[PDB]
């Protein structure tokens, strides 16, 4: 009954709003990985707030937060490897703490908070995201006025690599849930962020 | 923690008893169980019917091979009337035509031939009420609606043009919210679910609308080389848990 | 000592008499199963009775049923997968109880007795035949006139499918074993109608 | 029950143990005994020979990997006489060759290198009597009749060239009726055979006509992609149990 | 005895622990600590400093993934000067250079992308002094000597042209007399080692010359299709036991 | 400290003097093994005291035996399987005893004293060789004139072949390896064998 119970949700939110097509989420949701030698290279980047990307939003979590102006509570952000059983390799999720920028380094995201992703030895790795604020609650939508809203950002990188014997696809897909944790809780309700009506009725 | 790499579940095993059927499969799911329920039968307060239903257990709950689908690379999903399919085939499903009223949850299994490769995992849902809608002529103002054929699929589970068009309205992103157990194929592409409900309706005839349409929508592409096998069939096969019907009466496909 | 002993015996008939050569048992011997998209095609077919068919009297089992006028016993019949380790696929083989006509569908014949075949789960299935008879004992050779001789049918189905990376072959082979089941008699024996002799010597 | 899929046996492992050699494979078969029975030494009341037999044990008794053939997709198998194989080495080859009788059940070990690819299984077997016959023209007037080369292939073991015509007259199908083990090489592919046996003859000397024929050939082709190594090497290693023998004197090939 | 097969080692797993971080890797090594010592803390009685040394265990003693570097079919090693490469990264490196006195063992990882097709196992190994040599002219005459770069690599850990060139004028053959953990990759391509070490000089500032280098160098060549993936990175992952520096002072890179 | 302890070293000696270059020893060094119809090819041979085939001196071993004049210890011989795991097959490999020839046989060979290796069954297998001596001390520079001094000869041969599926090499390597056994001595140390000064210096 509780709307924080919708927000434990696994449902899917995508890495980062990409639309190839507005009527396809699907196009954004996938986020391809493919071999590459280059080192470091970025898989993806998105605020880690839910509100900020935008398919946090659509996924029930983003949706809920629109609800509530204020948040706070641990965020979890599962990353499932689609890829062929064959292939292997390794990825860097982290989460810059506010505060930093986005580090636009390997070695810059690397030290924040992040952790190492074997692929083969797990298919898929869970990215974990703290609540670490300045504030007790947190204002659902982030303004360019207000700091103390903004929770973050994650980024995806290439640790090692992405490798597969040839007879296996160059290139393969990474999938994203997203859901609270635990001790997640919401305030200030306001009117329906999630959804405004086109129009209301007499 | 469940293992984090598998779509999975199961290497390990997973078998389905029912009567006069078992079902084993070393590529297996383990079983998800709905809302942490598991199926019961209608308890006397729960039952208004006053007439004592008849609850064939075995023959009645037990493995049907329903169907097989080759997937391609992606397909689009069908999903799976759950009273009808059960229907055409007997016992349950002459009983279930015959019978005005079932209600049951039921065991299912999907299974693939077991590749490694497979990829692209597939979003296996059950959803109760699923109801399905139109574009409406798509400028929505066309107000447009069912078939009859449609809403009765019969064994065959007649599929959903599109994933969100799968019922109803509902992105593929957002119907994680209902749970599913995803195939990824990553691993052995198996699922096993047990899906108790209890019904929104107290009761269905389910002789009509069903009670539940399984779906079958695959989230991730199929990725693959030239090099192997362009074809995996998927198959489904469920068994009731024992259900309860009431009205004797005679025989109607309805 | 007992016939019976060698009726139990592994050796092999052919699933369906199929002569490429009359010289070699064994064209008809293996059956192919191959990588094909339809759905419930059939695999083969034969009359479970040993006599009928023919492969299963060259067997020995075969040549023992011939001996006697009647056998009862369960027959056991077990399919050897030949394919590669890569391959995979499932198959449907069933008994069509007697007083059924060859199914001639996937549907029709699954109910009947059947087992499901998952190949890779298991590189052999192993089917079983049920005595099932209005007469205690049942005649060997069975012509037109007797049902009561008549046991039935088996045929083998395409449950799923036949899968295999390519690098690996298409095609591959099913072998053909069968038994008698521990309780297995035979009666009213008869001048050996496995064996005639071309001629008699004074 | 055996574990369905395999041909195999054994991923397990088989150790095979005879003096001054010791043989392990992972990739080996269960051992599969002749009868029911092992091997055993020759009762008083069951030898006549009034003299005493030598039991060499461990030089005797050992591992010997006579021969290696490659094989292809398909190959004519090819069968070896128990006697003479061995006897063409030492040290039992020697002692057999010098002593009159020859009388001792084996182990008898085949092992491919192992491919998990390979399928088409082989069947193995041994033989007792095995008693060769020819075409005899064909018109089957001809009457014809064995080469004394053919009758001891020595260590080679001179194969047949049909399968039937392995020995004797004796369809492949119906072969089966002795028993073999049957490498599918669907799994590892690994015999392990102990044939103790009673032979018919209450002796042979074996320095002639062989106690056993140890056949090899294949029921199902060995079929396989233009991808995958063409060739693998099947070899046979043996170890007799005690033999025993009788008749010290000179030495002869014969 | 350890498994013949694998350089390996581990299939089984290893992990690595230090503060502020853990590691596990199924892909992994079998720790092999160096000469039978585990890396401890210096006595007092070893101890001349007498100023007492700040000891910052976990986020000093933890996991630095310094350096990626991509494996070609072969390639030229390089090899990682133990101090600077700390050194550069914080918080540890900030420390080192800032201190004068850094001694410390550490816990080495080195991981690759698993491959169980690579082959071509690659040297991996510690050397204390590690001295570095020029052909000098390759006439001899030259007399030629040290870049101070080359001598901090920093992070880097720069490679070194030539396998023998590997220090010093140690011949791949010869080289293995320092002890190795190979990565063969035939198996999964990991190595743990963890080097305590009793240090030639009783105190290194390793603000210059470092105390250990850590080389990579491949013995045999990878060797694989066309049919199968180019690249496999490898990645080192090194932790150091609890340190030990004095001299507090200002910063200097140095 | 003794000397025996830098014997035992895992350092690596090259299976038979072959320079390709003077300079890389590696060439000799890694012994090629490829898939090869024939049955019982010679993989390799070494005389396998140290001192003949010279990869040995130049290994630890090979350079403490030159240092002494006798020693006597069984010597171990181990060799790593560098080709791919996909890959397959068994060699044989045989220490010929003193009075003995090189087999120039596979049965010849065999006899004597072997291992069976089996590929996939164990990447490395470790041969064994003993000290068989008349004399209880042997020389280190065998000349053409001592028999006493002789050790004898290492060959390595086919058992079964080399099999990999195509998708992999068809030629891998073989690593070499030696060490002495926990009982093994020397004598009689001399001038540095091992080491000759190009120039004394005053």
Redesign the interface.
Known sequence: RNLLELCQIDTIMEVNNLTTNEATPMERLRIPVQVQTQSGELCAAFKADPGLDGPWQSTMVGQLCRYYTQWSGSLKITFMFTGSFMATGKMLIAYTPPGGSLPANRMQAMLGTHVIWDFGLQSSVTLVVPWISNTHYRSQATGSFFDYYATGIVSLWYQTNFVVPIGAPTTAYIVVLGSAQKNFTMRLCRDTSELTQAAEYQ | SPT????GYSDRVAQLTVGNST?T???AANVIVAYGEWPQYCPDTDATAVDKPTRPDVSVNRFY?LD???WSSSSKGWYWKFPDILAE??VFGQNAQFHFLYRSGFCIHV???????????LLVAVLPEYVTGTVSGNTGHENTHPPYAATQPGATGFELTNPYILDAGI???????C??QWI?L??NNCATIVVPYINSVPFDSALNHCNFGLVVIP???L???????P???I?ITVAPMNSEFSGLRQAVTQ
């Open positions: 984090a790499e598998a779509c079902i499969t070393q590529e091979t097989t689908k080759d085939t007997g299974q693939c031939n077991a590749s490694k490769f497979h990829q692209g995992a992105p593929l992103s957002q119907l994680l919210v749970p599913h990824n990553r691993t989230v991730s592409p990725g693959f080389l030239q090099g192997a096998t074809t995996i069939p198959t």
